[PDB]
Amino acid sequence: HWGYGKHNGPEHWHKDFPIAKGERQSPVDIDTHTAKYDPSLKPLSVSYDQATSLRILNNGHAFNVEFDDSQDKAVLKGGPLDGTYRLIQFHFHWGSLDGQGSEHTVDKKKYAAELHLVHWNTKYGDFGKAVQQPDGLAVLGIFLKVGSAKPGLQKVVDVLDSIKTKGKSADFTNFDPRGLLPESLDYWTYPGSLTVPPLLECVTWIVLKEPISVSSEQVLKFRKLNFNGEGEPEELMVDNWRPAQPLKNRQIKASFK
Ligand SMILES: NS(=O)(=O)c1c(F)c(F)c(SCCO)c(F)c1N[C@H]1CCc2ccccc21
Numbered sequence: 001h002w003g004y005g006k007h008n009g010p011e012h013w014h015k016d017f018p019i020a021k022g023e024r025q026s027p028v029d030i031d032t033h034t035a036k037y038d039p040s041l042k043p044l045s046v047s048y049d050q051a052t053s054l055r056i057l058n059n060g061h062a063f064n065v066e067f068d069d070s071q072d073k074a075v076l077k078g079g080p081l082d083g084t085y086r087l088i089q090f091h092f093h094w095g096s097l098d099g100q101g102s103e104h105t106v107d108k109k110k111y112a113a114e115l116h117l118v119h120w121n122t123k124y125g126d127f128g129k130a131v132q133q134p135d136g137l138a139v140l141g142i143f144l145k146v147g148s149a150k151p152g153l154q155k156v157v158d159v160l161d162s163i164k165t166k167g168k169s170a171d172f173t174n175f176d177p178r179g180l181l182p183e184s185l186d187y188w189t190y191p192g193s194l195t196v197p198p199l200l201e202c203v204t205w206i207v208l209k210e211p212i213s214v215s216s217e218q219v220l221k222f223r224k225l226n227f228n229g230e231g232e233p234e235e236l237m238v239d240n241w242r243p244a245q246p247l248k249n250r251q252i253k254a255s256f257k
């Protein structure tokens with residue numbers, strides 16, 4: 001099946017998922033000089049006060065923290081969005097080395113990891129309907145750089161040894177995603193796609209300008225996870241990022257400067 005290795009990694013995905021070569025694929029390199037400042041873009045509204053995290057799961061590609069999205073408890077709106085989007089899950093992509101790991105790049109610079117908070121447009125009623133729509137998802141992307149620890153990340157890092165292998169899950173209640181945000185909500189935005197198969201072109205991407213900093217020990221703990229299931233040979237879960245895709249007929253808009 002698809003993955004991140006030599007024989008099934010991103011350069012192979014188009015054979016099963018032809019939209020891999022589509023018109024609005026993600027991620028992309030953000031050229032900060034050519035992003036258009038749009039003064040009509042609104043501040044982002046991140047309303048995470050009533051978030052209910054449920055569980056954390058190793059799916060063999062990354063780990064996901066899942067939320068109760070059956071009511072408007074943790075929503076994203078404003079910014080470039082017209083609707084209300086509900087938080088369903090977050091996950092990360094990261095590298096084998098601190099110099100790589102993010103999906104988006106900024107002037108060709110890679111970060112050590114990238115957090116994706118995935119939300120779906122509540123006019124479509126559920127996540128599965130939303131992914132079939134050009135405006136169905138809004139994914140808030142936050143870069144991680146290695147420096148000082150992120151205290152709000154530590155509850156995540158601490159539970160990872162309990163979901164080491166493909167298919168494992170653990171209860172993960174009372175996790176507050178506001179702990180993962182940087183100080184500024186200035187952002188870039190562009191229309192794009194999921195960054196794994198099925199690569200559907202249903203995403204409004206909102207990528208925060210300001211990274212969060214995490215410690216070397218925090219990111220090292222991510223690289224101890226495994227892509228394989230228990231009692232299969234060990235394949236460390238590292239480098240689970242898709243490279244930048246061509247921007248094609250798209251413009252990245254900036255909410256700042
Ligand atoms: N960067 S992303 O938002 O495209 C993404 C990833 F890159 C992931 F690696 C994963 S791990 C599960 C893969 O099947 C994601 F869930 C999601 N997001 C979820 C969003 C729900 C969904 C549906 C189909 C595929 C992926 C996803």
Ligand code: NA
Pocket residue numbers: 147215216217
């Ligand atoms: Na350190």
Ligand SMILES: [Zn+2]
Pocket residue numbers: 091092093116195
């Ligand atoms: Zn992602």
